[PDB]
Amino acid sequence: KPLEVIKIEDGVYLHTSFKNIEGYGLVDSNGLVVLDNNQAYIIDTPWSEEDTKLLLSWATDRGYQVMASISTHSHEDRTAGIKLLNSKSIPTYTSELTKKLLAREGKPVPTHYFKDDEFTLGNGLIELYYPGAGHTEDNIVAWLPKSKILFGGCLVRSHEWEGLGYVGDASISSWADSIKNIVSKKYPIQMVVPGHGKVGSSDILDHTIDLAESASN
């Protein structure tokens, strides 16, 4: 089932990829391609490397220069596409914690990494933020000040789910505190993109907190 790419705002594109199988259904995962003129920035590589190659095709066929990718944590729906992009000399970005954590697992690692809780890419275009542990110890989010879109990755859950889902890496205890750190940025969010499922509004934050305290208590 091949990659899908669609525009969700000027210079912002949603890519959805489909990994499946072995007696479970089809799972979808989302990331973005964010444009500043001809220059593209990828947020979370497609699951597989064959779909990541297609995403790179989508970009360059349209004459886009792919400046960098950013992964939102060490798990593979966000990552191991990092290997391919490295092989092409395209800068791959994560948090330091994430880079170290990928190394500990002997998995391929980004060539670039940022050190504190905040970091900006594209000269203003993409603001990254580590709010604390949640779905994973290292999950970050990305804020796009132009389109007023927050990419929540698996730190958040679309309205279509009713369970945080996977928590083996998680800190249900601390999840609620992390989303609140997000709400504290007071981003003027007009849209949230989850790692899985459907794009929605700012209300996805509240719904996520709804499920984090439901599972602590």
- Which residues are near Mg ion by CB under 5 A? 15, 17, 29, 31, 46
99 lies in the binding site for Zn ion (CB under 5 A): no
Output phi, psi for 196, to 5 deg. Answer: -150, 135
CB of 31 to its own copies, least distance (A): 12
The Cα 189–Cα 29 span in angstroms is 21
106 lies in the binding site for its own copies (CB under 8 A): no
> Binding residue per annotation — 159?
no
Stretch that binds its own copies, among 16-24, 61-69, 183-191, 202-210 (CB under 8 A): 16-24
Neighbour count for residue 13 (Cβ, 10 Å): 20
- Among 42, 97, 150, 154, which residue interacts with Zn ion (rule: CB under 5 A)? 154
Site for its own copies in 149-188 (CB under 8 A): 154, 157, 163, 165-168
2 lies in the binding site for its own copies (CB under 8 A): no
Judged by CB, which is closer to its own copies: 64, or 161? 161
Q: For residue 22, what are its two tokens? A: 């072995």
Q: At what angle do helices 203-214 and 172-185 cross, to 10 degrees?
A: 160
What is the C-alpha end-to-end distance of the chain, expressed in Å? Answer: 39
What b-and-e string marks burial along 91-108, b requiring 16 or more CB atoms within 10 Å of the CB? bbbbbebbbebbeeeeeb
CB of 102 to Mg ion, least distance (A): 18
Strand stretches in 89-147, DSSP E: 92-95, 112-114, 118-121, 126-129, 141-144
CB of 15 to Mg ion, least distance (A): 5
Site for Zn ion in 18-57 (CB under 5 A): 23
> Binding residue per annotation — 76?
no
The Cα 198–Cα 162 span in angstroms is 13
Q: What residues make contact with its own copies under the rule CB under 8 A?
A: 1, 19-27, 29, 47, 75-78, 135, 154, 157, 163, 165-168, 195-196
Annotated binding site for Ca(2+): which residue ranges? 69
